[PDB]
Design a protein around this ligand. Sequence first.
Ligand code: NI
Ligand code: NI
Length: 478
Amino acid sequence: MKVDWLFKNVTVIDGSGGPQYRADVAVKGDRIMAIAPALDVAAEQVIDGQGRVLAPGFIDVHTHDDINVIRMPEYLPKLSQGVTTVIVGNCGISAATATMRGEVPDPMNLLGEQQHFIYPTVEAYAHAVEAARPSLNVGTLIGHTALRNNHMDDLFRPANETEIAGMRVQLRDALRQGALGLSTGLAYASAFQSTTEEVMALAEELAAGKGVYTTHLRSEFEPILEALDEAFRIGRHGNVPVVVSHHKCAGAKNWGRTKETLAFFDEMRQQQDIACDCYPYSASSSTLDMKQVTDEFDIVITWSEAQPEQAGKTLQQIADEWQVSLHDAAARLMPAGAIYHNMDEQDVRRVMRYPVTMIGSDGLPNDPMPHPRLWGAFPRVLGHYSRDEQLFPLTTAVHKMTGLSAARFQLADRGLVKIGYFADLVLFDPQTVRDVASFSDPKRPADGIEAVMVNGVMSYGSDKKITGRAGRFLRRRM
Ligand code: NI
Ligand code: NI
């Protein structure tokens, strides 16, 4: 009878995108018990949340935390932002159902070394999450490139009918055990030689609401309308939902072309169900590539094993200090990590203002000197873009990382502050919330986040310390 938590006088932004209101919210166990203008109830712990916003736990729909949630259960980078659930297994790479008979193909090395791929079924990955006891919930997609490596000798050829038939059966068993859908990373060499027909066969397993098709497009540059026209056809072939992962118009030539892609979205969202996600930044973070070296935008060096002295400077500054060309300056700096300012700020804002666009950090945890999105992708939307820049009301901003995300991936009883739903909550100050992570100082906790609750367990406070490990493995709504 005595509730566990009572949030008094909080501005409730329920994550539905609807109007905000002030009320009391009571939690008993892992469920939201009561919501009323006031609650004269006895509680074990009470919090006066006046002037604060009580919102659903933030859902990071685009992560690569397949292995990291297990060896770092207290996932401070996401929890300090207010993330209570991560969707892993994006871009065709996933640790679930992955089997390694030889070497690790690209880009599955982002998840971890061979030694960590020990999850041949979704059930085996689920129990490993439960054993690790993480601080946040974990749901997984199935990586197409991982399914290829389980059934093909070489990944640089079109798959035969027998190999594709085996992938459909393994994907079917994964979806029955709680997988959220299928992810593809077609731009990578391990899946570039795949026909659209092969992806169509796998996407058919997602019919009748058995998953969502998230896609790293085959090209995010000039032929992006081609790759989008693909992506929509595979969804139209099996009548399955499509989510364009980290939608961006990379390359100086494609700057401003979001007016063309989002228009292609509008025309095709009148025939099928389409969505997308993106991180609120106009700069990339990857390895220093010779084919990516250019003068059209800044290329800041994060780390450089060859020349560790030249760090934090643009490639043009390094090339001028050495009095050598750009391609030769990079050649002597490689291998290195670089920040590619290859995106236009107006393009990011258009994608963010798009109604069916979700917020995905796409953070790289194992990456030494990581992109600041790993520590402040979600507070950046709530603070800089919603409050300061006024891109959208705070209700819409919260909706793009909660209810819209939970409904898209069919997360049962999550993403909403509602009676009977799970008690994944975050209490933040709407006037001071901001991303503190910068490109020079990325691994830094955010401000304004005052409380984070996972399944009714208070897991993170304003002292920047993790106090709970009540994360669970989430299975698709059945
Ligand atoms: Ni990707
Ligand atoms: Ni990704």
